[PDB]
Amino acid sequence: ERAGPVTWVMMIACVVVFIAMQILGDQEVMLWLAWPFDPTLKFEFWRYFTHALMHFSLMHILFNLLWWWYLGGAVEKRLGSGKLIVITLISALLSGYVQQKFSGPWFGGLSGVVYALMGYVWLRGERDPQSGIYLQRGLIIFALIWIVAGWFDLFGMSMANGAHIAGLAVGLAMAFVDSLNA
Ligand SMILES: CCCCCCCCCO[C@@H]1O[C@H](CO)[C@@H](O)[C@H](O)[C@H]1O
Ligand SMILES: CCCCCCCCCO[C@@H]1O[C@H](CO)[C@@H](O)[C@H](O)[C@H]1O
């Protein structure tokens, strides 16, 4: 059992971007991938999403990717690539927006998308067990610890609590909708 294409390309893209940052420096990469930081850049649409591709520390990308690999993988295998694509696109946009609004355009990471994924996987398993998707009991605990780490700023994750809540809201919403069909 190997992780699907969406799960795989995201991880590799994040690693490729991370390397570009070690070489060129965080600054340079952000100049090109950050959420529009100036009116002159408002129509460079990739920026509304590419901010999720940057990470600022080893622990940052390590945990983001472990979570993305486990949850993203599960969703893609059990619900398809399309399902993961939408959750990722929407959460990336919403969280980025909330982040930008309250703290400025200088941020990055897949943590907003991770919160959405934790929300979706957990909620869907609780409401629609047999759907096959669910967040392993023991992993709920480490998920909560990862959450607490960011919430009380014990672990630097780039994004603020408000942006992470927006990410979570997206995953909970989609999970609510999905366990609403049948
Ligand atoms: C939340 C994760 C979202 C990841 C989305 C990454 C999308 C990258 C899209 O880039 C686009 O690729 C084109 C290729 O030619 C360029 O021409 C264009 O200028 C550029 O904008
Ligand atoms: C702005 C949100 C849109 C998300 C942007 C997704 C960009 C996908 C770029 O990936 C490439 O897609 C090709 C599709 O054929 C594959 O052949 C190729 O292997 C893969 O590397």
Ligand SMILES: CCCCCCCCCO[C@@H]1O[C@H](CO)[C@@H](O)[C@H](O)[C@H]1O
């Ligand atoms: C403690 C916080 C971090 C938890 C990280 C759990 C990682 C579990 C990774 O599992 C892998 O997932 C892929 C996609 O589902 C499968 O293709 C693969 O066979 C499986 O081995």
Ligand SMILES: CCCCCCCCCO[C@@H]1O[C@H](CO)[C@@H](O)[C@H](O)[C@H]1O
């Ligand atoms: C939130 C979205 C994040 C980016 C998602 C990118 C998915 C890119 C999928 O690539 C696809 O991989 C297949 C297997 O290799 C190729 O056959 C195909 O040509 C290519 O299109």
Ligand SMILES: CCCCCCCCCO[C@@H]1O[C@H](CO)[C@@H](O)[C@H](O)[C@H]1O
């Ligand atoms: C720094 C924290 C690192 C935590 C490492 C946790 C290792 C145990 C995780 O087990 C994983 O559980 C998933 C759910 O059952 C399986 O799908 C997967 O195959 C299995 O590998």
Ligand SMILES: CCCCCCCCCO[C@@H]1O[C@H](CO)[C@@H](O)[C@H](O)[C@H]1O
């Ligand atoms: C993303 C974090 C989501 C909230 C975590 C909830 C912790 C409180 C326990 O809840 C649920 O209680 C059931 C009965 O004990 C468990 O069987 C189930 O596994 C667990 O989920």
Ligand SMILES: CCCCCCCCCO[C@@H]1O[C@H](CO)[C@@H](O)[C@H](O)[C@H]1O
């Ligand atoms: C459905 C989408 C979910 C969006 C969630 C938005 C929550 C943003 C939380 O706001 C925060 O509240 C604190 C107290 O009011 C302020 O101190 C802080 O500056 C502000 O950032």
